[PDB]
Ligand binder design. Structure first.
Ligand SMILES: Cc1cc2nc3c(=O)[nH]c(=O)nc-3n(C[C@H](O)[C@H](O)[C@H](O)COP(=O)(O)O)c2cc1C
Lengths: 386, 145
């Protein structure tokens, strides 16, 4: 999501002659994402091809994917370079998977990508494989030792048990992933020598994915300070259960309750406080002083006392947080950067217009008819202080 | 309010990076040392050292490795036609017509099999393939005359 959302890195990774999946978690519409593919295909040199990643998590995205898949359908009906589709966070049911495989863009899909997290999820994909035996299906088996979206399932035991049934389908391409930064450590899974430690006879793999080790890369959009942070983090051997920051890495749960692997060394303030607040919420009112100050430490600022705070302080706080002085929102608008906050600028307007709405005793003729003009209002907007 | 949309601050932000949720994995972090190392370098580093390990023991300076530095191939012109499912026209990608030419053809003909230069694959759909000017592969389809 953060890493591959940039059209620059996924292009550069592909231009290096490598397979990559464009992130869909950073694209909220067909149009905004169609810009990325267009930026991709422009930065895509002749013939080179890439794939796309999608999430199963929420209904709104799955309804957006109906427009998204038809976008992918339209793109490839137009002959778009994107040669694959990646379903994430869950395995679609047979009728849902058949649809994806059999789409008008099917040949341009050329294979389908699934990411099973459990034994049952693996067995589900096997049934998707037997569905269309002539359709290539790349099964990426991840761990919970991996980054981001998490799981309680071991790296080995899952693949150790399900491998035999996975190889009874020729259309299944087995790909092991997670906790791999190097060719040396990942060489044994390729030779099949990795299963020998568990006594099982050799168990070779068809491919390997690297999520984490590519984050510190040059063409990645990761900030200079964030890269240095990922670097100095020391790594670990097989994941341990004991709750702590483990080798600069501690798990944490998202808003939905699912675990997320985040960096607890580079940033120790957000994760641990979150675990404090989460486990502490009954009595929050009692620890309010301790809790409200810690939000300010991680820069999740509450506002100074709500009543007593002057309307300036309100309106000056939004400008403070929304408008960066270094990036110069006015100068940020000119390149037409995707980082543009314009909803935040629109947010501040609705607050400004509310301020006029609150204090005006008269008919509201003079004030409202001015700031609402395009040419006039937009000029007023690029200069927040004025 | 806390956890929502926390993934974007790691990229292009001047703020203190110790306040941000940034996502590694636990064990993969050990393999992360070099900073601002180009994607092309990391991915090749994987492939190049995987090749060497495979080369040294089993292959021992294989014909495949030697053929590469000397430019020799697998899947020549005749195979490439029957291999790649995608047929490019300009910047657009199309399915290989041979897939629908090979089997569905009533009369299909492969001329001079073992000889590569003279190799020709023709069909009753009136579509024929041959090589011209070295690397250029010539597919010739016809309607009536
Ligand atoms: C920052 C980040 C974002 C990720 N986003 C997604 C995602 O949107 N969908 C998905 O299936 N996996 C996602 N992953 C997981 C990777 O696709 C991959 O499975 C995992 O990172 C591989 O494990 P490793 O990086 O620890 O070696 C993400 C991983 C990271 C580090």
């Amino acid at each position: 999501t953060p890493t591959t959302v940039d059209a620059k890195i996924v292009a550069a990774a592909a231009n290096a002659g490598h397979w990559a999946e464009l992130a869909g978690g950073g694209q909220v519409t067909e149009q905004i994402f169609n810009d990325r593919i267009a930026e991709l295909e422009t930065l895509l040199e002749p013939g080179r091809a890439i794939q796309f990643n999608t999430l199963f998590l929420d209904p709104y995205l799955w309804k957006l994917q109906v427009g998204g898949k038809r976008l992918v359908q339209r793109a490839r009906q137009s002959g778009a370079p994107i040669d694959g589709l990646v379903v994430s966070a869950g395995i679609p049911d047979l009728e849902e998977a058949v649809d994806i495989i059999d789409e008008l863009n099917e040949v341009g899909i050329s294979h389908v990508v699934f990411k099973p997290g459990t034994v049952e999820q693996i067995r589900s994909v096997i049934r998707i494989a037997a569905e269309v035996p002539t359709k290539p299906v790349i099964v990426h088996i991840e761990g919970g030792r991996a980054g981001g979206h998490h799981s309680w399932e071991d790296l080995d035991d899952l693949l150790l048990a399900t491998y035999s049934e996975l190889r009874s389908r020729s259309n299944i391409t087995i790909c092991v992933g997670g906790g791999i930064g190097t060719p040396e450590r990942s060489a044994e899974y390729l030779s099949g020598r990795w299963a020998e430690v568990h006594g099982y006879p050799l168990m070779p793999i068809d491919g390997i994915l690297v999520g984490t080790a590519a984050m510190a890369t040059l063409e990645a959009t990761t900030s200079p300070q964030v890269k240095q942070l990922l670097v100095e983090t020391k790594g670990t051997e097989a994941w341990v259960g004991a709750g702590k920051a483990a080798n600069g890495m501690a798990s944490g749960r998202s808003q939905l309750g699912a675990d997320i692997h985040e960096i607890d060394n580079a940033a120790s303030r957000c994760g641990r406080l979150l675990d404090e607040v989460a486990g502490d919420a009954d009595a929050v009112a009692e620890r309010r002083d301790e809790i409200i100050a810690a939000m300010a430490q991680t820069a999740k600022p509450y506002f100074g006392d709500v009543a007593e705070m002057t309307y300036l302080q309100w309106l000056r706080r939004y400008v403070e947080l929304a408008i960066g002085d270094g990036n110069s929102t006015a100068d940020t608008k000119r390149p037409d950067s995707p980082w543009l906050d314009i909803t935040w600028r629109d947010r501040f307007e609705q607050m400004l217009k509310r301020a006029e709405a609150r204090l005006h005793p008269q008919d509201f003729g003079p004030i409202e008819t001015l700031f609402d003009a395009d040419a006039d209002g937009e000029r007023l907007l690029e200069d927040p202080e004025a | 309010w806390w956890r929502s949309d926390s993934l974007w601050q790691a990229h292009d932000a001047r703020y203190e990076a110790d306040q941000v949720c940034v996502i590694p994995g636990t064990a993969a972090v050990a393999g992360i040392t070099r900073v601002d190392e180009p994607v092309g370098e990391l991915l090749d580093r994987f492939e190049q050292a995987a090749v060497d390990e495979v080369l040294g023991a089993g292959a021992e300076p294989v014909e495949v490795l030697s053929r590469r530095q000397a430019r020799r191939d697998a899947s020549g012109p005749l195979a490439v036609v029957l291999d790649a499912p995608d047929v490019l026209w300009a910047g657009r990608m199309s399915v290989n017509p041979v897939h629908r030419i090979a089997a569905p053809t009533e009369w299909q003909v492969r001329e001079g099999s073992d000889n590569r230069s003279a190799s020709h694959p023709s069909t009753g759909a009136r579509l024929e393939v041959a090589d011209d000017q070295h690397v250029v592969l010539s597919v010739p389809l016809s309607g009536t005359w």
